[PDB]
Amino acid sequence: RPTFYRQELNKTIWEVPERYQNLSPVGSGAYGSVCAAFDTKTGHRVAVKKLSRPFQSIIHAKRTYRELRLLKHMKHENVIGLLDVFTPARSLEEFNDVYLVTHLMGADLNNIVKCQKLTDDHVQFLIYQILRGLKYIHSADIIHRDLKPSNLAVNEDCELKILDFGLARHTDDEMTGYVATRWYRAPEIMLNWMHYNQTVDIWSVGCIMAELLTGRTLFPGTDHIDQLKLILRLVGTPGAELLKKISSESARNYIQSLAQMPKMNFANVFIGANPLAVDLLEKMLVLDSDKRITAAQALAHAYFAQYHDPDDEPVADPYDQSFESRDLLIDEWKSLTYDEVISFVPPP
Ligand SMILES: Nc1cccc(Oc2ccccn2)c1
Ligand SMILES: [Cl-]
Ligand SMILES: [Cl-]
Ligand SMILES: [Cl-]
Ligand SMILES: [Cl-]
Numbered sequence: 001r002p003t004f005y006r007q008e009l010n011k012t013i014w015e016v017p018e019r020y021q022n023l024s025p026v027g028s029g030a031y032g033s034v035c036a037a038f039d040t041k042t043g044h045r046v047a048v049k050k051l052s053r054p055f056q057s058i059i060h061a062k063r064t065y066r067e068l069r070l071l072k073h074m075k076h077e078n079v080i081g082l083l084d085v086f087t088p089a090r091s092l093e094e095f096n097d098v099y100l101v102t103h104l105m106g107a108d109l110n111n112i113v114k115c116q117k118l119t120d121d122h123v124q125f126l127i128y129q130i131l132r133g134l135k136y137i138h139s140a141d142i143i144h145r146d147l148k149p150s151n152l153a154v155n156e157d158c159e160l161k162i163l164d165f166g167l168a169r170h171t172d173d174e175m176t177g178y179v180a181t182r183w184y185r186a187p188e189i190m191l192n193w194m195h196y197n198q199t200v201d202i203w204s205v206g207c208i209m210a211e212l213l214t215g216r217t218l219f220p221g222t223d224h225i226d227q228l229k230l231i232l233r234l235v236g237t238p239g240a241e242l243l244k245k246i247s248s249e250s251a252r253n254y255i256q257s258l259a260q261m262p263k264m265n266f267a268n269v270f271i272g273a274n275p276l277a278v279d280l281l282e283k284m285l286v287l288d289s290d291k292r293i294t295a296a297q298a299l300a301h302a303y304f305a306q307y308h309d310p311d312d313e314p315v316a317d318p319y320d321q322s323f324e325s326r327d328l329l330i331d332e333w334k335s336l337t338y339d340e341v342i343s344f345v346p347p348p
């Protein structure tokens with residue numbers, strides 16, 4: 001066991017191993033508080049997240065276990081991984097607090113899309129890396145569920161990492177009105193008309209790629225219905241066969257109430273873009289999720305000819321998610337989480 005030291009920074013007690021120095025507050029959602037620190041063991045600048053109320057309900061205890069299992073699994077150059085996890089507790093009986101340690105990220109895509117001039121070569125390399133990471137994620141039967149520019153970290157050498165996996169977190173208030181939290185989501189799951197599957201992420205990559213090419217949000221809806229009207233004007237309304245896949249009669253009568261519209265000419269929407277970029281956008285932004293290109297298929301598209309290497313596009317170890325269908329008590333979820341903290345082995 002390392003030696004721990006205690007301090008109060010911005011109304012919060014932080015108890016952390018001596019290896020972590022020069023702690024400085026950086027942010028706090030409702031999920032936890034974050035400090036920047038210098039890790040003396042590895043020489044990296046890191047983010048230290050202290051979870052808030054990790055075991056306050058069955059829902060919160062299960063979400064704590066879910067986040068730790070997912071972070072311990074992810075070992076890929078284009079996906080955030082876990083540098084450390086710790087608790088100052090010396091036994092299960094006194095276990096209350098969980099701290100997570102990752103690489104400190106600087107800029108996100110938003111910073112570079114808003115204020116930088118992007119060549120077609122920059123768009124090829126950024127989208128290649130998103131798809132390389134998604135091939136790995138999807139090979140473990142994980143769905144990200146929240147891909148958007150603020151969840152993509154990018155450095156001065158245009159190298160990219162995926163972060164902030166969807167933990168079944170986002171609330172109704174958070175998805176309401178003129179908000180970036182909804183602009184990248186798939187049409188079939190906008191109002192939960194179909195169940196989630198890894199195909200919804202491929203819609204989000206198309207929305208990101210369009211915005212890197214134009215500098216503008218593709219579907220900036222003022223509410224769920226305005227956003228559906230912008231989507232169907234570009235990709236076309238559905239036909240009878242596809243419509244039948246939505247179980248809810250009300251949604252189909254709602255779908256059935258809009259005037260029919262054809263798919264638009266994407267060369268006349270994305271004026272001047274590389275024709276191979278236009279071709280790949282037509283294969284991602286398909287209304288029927290069964291017909292979208294997969295991450296593994298997209299890596300072999302001619303748009304990525306200068307970067308594609310099928311001997312350096314790895315898949316994941318198998319991921320057991322059977323816990324998701326399991327009914328347990330708060331203390332059972334807490335004991336599973338404790339075992340995962342104490343069994344952690346750090347990377348090389
Ligand atoms: N991916 C998919 C799945 C079922 C139906 C479908 O068509 C539509 C049409 C309009 C709005 C939403 N989904 C698309
Ligand atoms: Cl230490
Ligand atoms: Cl990492
Ligand atoms: Cl503790
Ligand atoms: Cl965003």
Ligand SMILES: [Cl-]
Pocket residue numbers: 318319320321
């Ligand atoms: Cl597993």
Ligand SMILES: [Mg+2]
Pocket residue numbers: 150151164
């Ligand atoms: Mg985020």
